[PDB]
Amino acid sequence: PTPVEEAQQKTIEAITKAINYMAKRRIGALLTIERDTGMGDYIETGIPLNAKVSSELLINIFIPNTPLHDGAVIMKNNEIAAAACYLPLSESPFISKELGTRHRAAVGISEVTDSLTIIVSEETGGVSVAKNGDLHRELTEEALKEMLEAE
């Protein structure tokens, strides 16, 4: 593997470790990975970080009742660009009616960008991914890894 490929794999590993920790503890989380569609306007609504990715930093960001947990982390160029960012809420009538604004925000950004967003539910610890306007629910760890590698 090249240094770029090793860097992507290390980032995937950091993401999945953090997601698993939060799912176990039913900590709500919202993590959007910018792709070809720029999301600077949304990044600018949050707290700037421009931080190296680590599972530890991701977990510390989403701790309940802390400054940085309310909103979305947005990742760009293999770094955490900002935390506590605003995402647009989807008006789609085809999202499961039991879900709240976290999932609607993930679907909403997925409607107007090619980004991939990961959501951890605070009600169940379930893990889902929003892309292209659809929400993929009740993912296993292997399913999430496959989506991150495919992306």
| Nearest CA among 76, 25, 70, 17 for reference residue 52 | 76
Count of Cβ atoms closer than 10 Å to residue 107 Cβ: 27
Angle of helix 141-150 relative to helix 3-25, nearest 10 degrees, comes to: 150
Count of Cβ atoms closer than 10 Å to residue 91 Cβ: 10
Asked if 12 is part of the footprint of a second copy (rule: CB under 8 A), the reply reads no
Among 16, 110, 113, 117, binds ligand R8S (CB under 6 A): 16
Per-residue contact flags (x/-) with a second copy for residues 102 to 131, judged by CB under 8 A:
------------------------------
The listed partner (ligand R8S, a second copy, Mg ion, none) that binds 127, CB under 5 to 8 Å by sort, is ligand R8S
The listed partner (Mg ion, a second copy, ligand R8S, none) that binds 59, CB under 5 to 8 Å by sort, is a second copy
| Nearest CA among 85, 72, 76 for reference residue 44 | 85
| Nearest CA among 67, 60, 65, 58 for reference residue 12 | 58
C-alpha 96, offset from chain centre:
19
Residue range at the interface with Mg ion (CB under 5 A); choices 69-77, 108-116, 119-127, 135-143: 135-143
Residue range at the interface with ligand R8S (CB under 6 A); choices 19-27, 44-52, 97-105, 129-137: 19-27
The listed partner (a second copy, Mg ion, ligand R8S, none) that binds 30, CB under 5 to 8 Å by sort, is none
Structure tokens at 27: 């900590």
Residues of this chain that interact with a second copy (CB under 8 A) are 47-52, 54-57, 59-61, 63, 66-69, 80, 83-84
